[PDB]
Amino acid sequence: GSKEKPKPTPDYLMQLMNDKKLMSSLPNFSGIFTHLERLLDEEISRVRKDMY
Amino acid sequence: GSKEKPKPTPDYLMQLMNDKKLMSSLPNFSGIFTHLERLLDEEISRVRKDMY
């Protein structure tokens, strides 16, 4: 085991929405982080689906 | 449905290891991105567990 994975909530998603936008406003982001972008596209996606 | 989620491979992980380090070398990262850090801690974690 390695780290406990905390639950996804609206708070998680509202912050994700601003993170995904912040990175999109950074043309340097694409070069500095590789998987970080896709992880929003999945996390934002799955957080929206697992929404209660 | 929203976006198809691609499989995790070693290539995914080797790049994650460098992304997680790049962000750790950025004291500005912590302020610019909120969930991006934890998503490595989970993705890197789960990619290592789902390793074949």
From Swiss-Prot, chains A, B:
The UniProt entry's coiled-coil ranges are none
Domain of life of the native organism: Eukaryota
The cellular location(s) given in this protein's UniProt record come to: Nucleus; Cytoplasm
Q: Which family does it belong to?
A: Belongs to the quaking family.
This protein's assembly is summarised as: Homodimer; does not require RNA to homodimerize.
**So what does this one do?**
RNA reader protein, which recognizes and binds specific RNAs, thereby regulating RNA metabolic processes, such as pre-mRNA splicing, circular RNA (circRNA) formation, mRNA export, mRNA stability and/or translation. Involved in various cellular processes, such as mRNA storage into stress granules, apoptosis, interferon response, glial cell fate and development. Binds to the 5'-NACUAAY-N(1,20)-UAAY-3' RNA core sequence. Acts as a mRNA modification reader that specifically recognizes and binds mRNA transcripts modified by internal N(7)-methylguanine (m7G).
Q: What's the name of the protein?
A: KH domain-containing RNA-binding protein qki.S
Q: Which species does the entry assign this protein to? A: Xenopus laevis (African clawed frog)
Q: Which residues of the full protein are shown?
A: 8 to 57 of 341
